[PDB]
Design a protein around this nucleic acid. Structure first.
Ligand SMILES: [Cl-]
Ligand SMILES: [Cl-]
Ligand SMILES: [Mg+2]
Ligand SMILES: [Mg+2]
Ligand code: NA
Ligand code: NA
Ligand code: NA
Length: 326
DNA sequence: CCGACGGCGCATCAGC
DNA sequence: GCTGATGCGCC
DNA sequence: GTCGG
């Protein structure tokens, strides 16, 4: 982290644009610049130097010049002092409260953790659980705990049906020493792009994980995606582990490579790779890579037999998961 | 200048 | 009830 | 906010 001060500034600006301004392209621009700066292997000495990096333009270069000179950004100093901005930014830290809900709550005079706790009746299910575990959800998960969680999920899934394959993705698959949550890709040979030969495939797995008290709460749940909460078991006399966010995604088995590419991320890597694909005349999602016809309509799915095949199509050298933490 | 910027699952709601 | 829009979430 | 054409 040679340039932590700058990247922190850009991230705070990014969050302001998302949460307060509701300007999602500005949010993405700021995050893109922070990411490209984060991997730049020199300590940045000027805005001009930064402007040579793709994603950093005139305005960010200016902000970098202010920050290097003064150690701060007046623009952020003012934002931090704005009560309405501060409140909105805070409320969005609750899972299930986005920019829209946050502004609405502040309007109704709900703008603190205390306010939320006493207005539980005003929260939807997701938000209630987000509030319940507000503190826990802001803690990171050490890789050692992720390994324990992996063992539980892989072993319970096997107990349900030996044909399931569960793969832990997200920052974990990118080799991170700590993760924000647990991301599990699931496949079963009964669910392919051609047919669903068994119902409740995701349900059965969620059910089993609940039965063993690993999954503790549910934020949302459909046929292919579970979003919830889990917790490692603790030993006798041992303090409990924090509750953790878990996401499970059931992907057609024959579309595993596109799925694991997607669920491995990072999010910024996915945006960058998908944008590059478009430039190359392809569109990528978690299921397929398809050509774009002259018109602009996606064509048929191209054959994919490895993650690398996807990189080949768009003329990128293959990048291992550990090198995708953008 | 100015259009595009990744792609999609689940929850909630309005209109019919 | 359905469909489409929107919010919020995931990488 | 940045980029490409
Ligand atoms: Cl925007
Ligand atoms: Cl598709
Ligand atoms: Mg994750
Ligand atoms: Mg994330
Ligand atoms: Na640049
Ligand atoms: Na939130
Ligand atoms: Na996740």
């Amino acid at each position: 982290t040679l340039n932590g001060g700058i990247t922190d500034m850009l991230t705070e600006l990014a969050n302001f644009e998302k949460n307060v301004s509701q300007a999602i392209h500005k949010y993405n621009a700021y995050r893109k610049a922070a990411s490209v700066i984060a991997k730049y292997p020199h300590k940045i000495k000027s805005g001009a130097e930064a402007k040579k990096l793709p994603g950093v333009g005139t305005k960010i270069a200016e902000k970098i010049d202010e920050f290097l000179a003064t150690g701060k950004l007046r623009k952020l100093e003012k934002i931090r002092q704005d009560d309405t901005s501060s409140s909105i930014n805070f409320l969005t830290r609750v899972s299930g409260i986005g920019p829209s809900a946050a502004r609405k709550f502040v309007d109704e005079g709900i703008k603190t953790l205390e306010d939320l706790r006493k207005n539980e009746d005003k929260l939807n299910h997701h938000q209630r659980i987000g509030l319940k575990y507000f503190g826990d959800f802001e803690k990171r998960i050490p890789r050692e705990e992720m390994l324990q969680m992996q063992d539980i999920v892989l072993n319970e899934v096997k107990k349900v049906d030996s044909e399931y394959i569960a793969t832990v993705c997200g920052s974990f698959r990118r080799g991170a020493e700590s993760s924000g949550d647990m991301d599990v890709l699931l496949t079963h040979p009964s669910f392919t792009s051609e047919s669903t030969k068994q119902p409740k495939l995701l349900h059965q797995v969620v059910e089993q994980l609940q039965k063993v008290h690993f999954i503790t709460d549910t934020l949302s749940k459909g046929e292919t995606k579970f979003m919830g909460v889990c917790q490692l078991p603790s030993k006798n006399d041992e303090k409990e582990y924090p509750h953790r966010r878990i996401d499970i995604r059931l992907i057609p088995k024959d579309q595993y490579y596109c799925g694991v590419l997607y669920f491995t991320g990072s999010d910024i890597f996915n945006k960058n790779m998908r944008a590059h694909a478009l430039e190359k005349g392809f569109t990528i999602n978690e299921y397929t890579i398809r050509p774009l016809g002259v018109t602009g309509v996606a064509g048929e799915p191209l054959p994919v037999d490895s993650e690398k095949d996807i990189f080949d199509y768009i003329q990128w050298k293959y990048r291992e998961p550990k090198d995708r933490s953008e």
